[PDB]
């Protein structure tokens, strides 16, 4: 299941494996109205 994430570093995690499940990119953008990256992700966890 996806997560929704926001942070200034925009850390591109690409993909991972956790709890016998695979995890991967979906979308990100820079939200200039707030000055951080925002995304729809199935791996990034704000780190």
Cβ count near 38 (within 10 Å): 17
Experimental method of this PDB entry: NMR
- Provide the CATH number for the domain around residue 37: 2.20.20.70
Q: Residue 34 and residue 6: Cα distance in Å, rounded?
A: 10
Instruction: Enter the tokens of residue 43.
Output: 């791996």
Contact 9, 42 (CB under 8 A): no
**Residue of 43, 39, 33 whose CA lies nearest to 13:** 43
Task: Provide the domain count of the chain.
Answer: 1
Domain limits at 44? 1-47
Going 41 to 25 to 39 to 10, the CA torsion angle's sign is positive
The DSSP code sequence of 4-34 is EEEETT-----EEEETTEEEEEEEEEEETTT
């Amino acid at each position: 299941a996806i997560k929704l994430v926001q942070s200034p570093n925009g850390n591109f995690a690409a993909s991972f494996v956790l709890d016998g499940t695979k995890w991967i990119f979906k979308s990100k953008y820079y939200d200039s109205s707030k000055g951080y990256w925002v995304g729809i992700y199935e791996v990034w966890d704000r780190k």
